[PDB]
């Protein structure tokens, strides 16, 4: 799952633009950045963070987890 475009996430265009601001290209990139790091962003506010974390929990992989030897 960690190898799919952030496009395949069904998020509001505001969130997609904000994620392109930090050059997040694929998923998994989004998960190795915590909530406080993400929120310090132009236009990536509260409701967008709740939406992104709820969609992440639908994926089941909330923000924060670490893995090995990526990539």
């Amino acid at each position: 799952i960690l190898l799919r475009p952030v496009d395949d996430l069904e998020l509001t265009v505001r969130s997609a633009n904000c994620l392109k601001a930090e050059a997040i290209h694929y998923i998994g990139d989004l998960v190795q950045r915590t909530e406080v790091e993400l929120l310090k962003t132009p236009n990536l506010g509260k409701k967008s963070l709740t939406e992104i974390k709820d969609v992440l929990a639908s994926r089941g992989l909330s923000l924060g987890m670490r893995l090995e030897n990526w990539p």
Partner: protein, 110 residues
Amino acid sequence: MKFILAEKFTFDPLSNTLIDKEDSEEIIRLGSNESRILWLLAQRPNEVISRNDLHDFVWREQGFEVDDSSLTQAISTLRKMLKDSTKSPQYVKTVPKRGYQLIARVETVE
């Protein structure tokens, strides 16, 4: 350097203020995005500039990416606050498939 538009308005790129000579008492307040768009228009006197190029010069230096409806809304607010004509080519107009145009004259104060 300060610019004068159509011998009527004056504007500076560095402090983002507008002054109408007809009503010199009332200072006109503009947003940063529309002000930078108009300054970029003034840098190229009365020649067409692409929507794509002006958009990417205005907002990628800002560090963040937005959709193209933001450009249209910014131009709408620019035309509204300047009291420019709704669709007649008086100060600023839109040329389809090619970009955006300005009609007001450029007078560099200094």
